[PDB]
A paper describes a structure:
We present the co-crystal structure of Pur-alpha with a CGG trinucleotide-repeat DNA, providing a detailed structural explanation for nucleotide recognition. Crystals of Pur-alpha repeat I-II with a GCGGCGG trinucleotide-repeat ssDNA diffracted to a resolution of 2.0 Å. The DNA-bound protein shows the typical intramolecular dimer with two PUR repeats tightly intertwined with each other, forming a globular PUR domain. In the crystal structure, the DNA molecule 1 (DNA 1) is clamped between residues of PUR repeat I and II. PUR repeat II binds DNA 1 with the residue K138 of its β-sheet, and residues N140 and R142 of the short linker, whereas PUR repeat I contacts the DNA 1 via residues Q52, S53, and K54 in its short linker. Pur-alpha mainly binds to stacking guanine bases, but also to one of the cytosines (C5) and to the sugar phosphate backbone. Instead, F145 from the β-sheet of PUR repeat II stacks with the neighboring guanine G4 and thereby blocks the space for the cytosine C5. F145 of Pur-alpha shows particularly unusual characteristics by undergoing aromatic stacking with G4. This protein-DNA interaction blocks additional DNA-base stacking events and forces the DNA to flip out its cytosine base (C5), leading to a strong twist of the DNA 1 strand. In the crystal structure, an additional DNA-binding event was observed for PUR repeat I. The residues Y57, D59, K61, K70, and R80 of the β-sheet interact with the 3’-end of the second DNA molecule (DNA 2). All other mutations showed reduced DNA binding and only decreased unwinding. Together these observations suggest that the heterotypic stacking of DNA-bases with F145 in PUR repeat II stabilizes the single-stranded conformation of DNA and enforces a twist of the bases that is important for its unwinding activity.
Residue numbers in the entry: 40 to 183
DNA sequence: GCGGCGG
């Protein structure tokens, strides 16, 4: 029992993103879906307060990204976060990591509760963060 | 036209 309240769709590189504001008996939330070029779906759910936090943080990630030069690569593998933030809502944790690999820079958004439990993540090309931010802002202006 | 380092 989830009533749809508003939607936005974005095409970013080979991916499509849907931002949907919905409501159930406990309240309102925003669902963020990533659809890969092959059709693979990944989704995260956000309280509206968390969504606004997310929207706020995207600007600093974009500022940081815009200032970067070329990666540089030694001869060992690397994870490395270029930049990290974490958000919390109740028992849910959201990790925002700006990362680089051979496929470019991207924002990893990961949702977790416990080590042995359900996990969800989306991966947003760094070039799409401004567009994504402004889409989130449009929905936030209409809700909560 | 991708593609995102797990248990
Ligand atoms: Cl809330």
């Amino acid at each position: 029992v989830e009533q749809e309240l508003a939607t936005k769709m974005l095409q970013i590189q080979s991916k499509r993103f849907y931002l949907d504001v919905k409501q159930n008996r406990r309240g309102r939330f925003i669902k963020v879906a990533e659809i890969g070029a092959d059709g693979r779906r990944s989704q995260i759910y956000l309280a509206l307060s968390t969504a606004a936090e997310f929207r706020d943080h995207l600007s600093s990630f974009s500022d940081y990204y815009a200032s970067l030069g070329p990666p540089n690569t030694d001869n060992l593998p690397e994870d490395g976060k270029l930049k990290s933030e974490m958000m919390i809502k109740d028992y849910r944790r959201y990790y925002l990591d700006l990362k680089e690999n051979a496929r470019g820079r991207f924002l990893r958004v990961s949702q977790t509760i416990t080590r042995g439990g359900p996990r969800s993540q989306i991966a947003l090309p760094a070039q799409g963060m401004i567009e994504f931010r402004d889409a989130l802002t449009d929905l936030l202006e209409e809700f909560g």
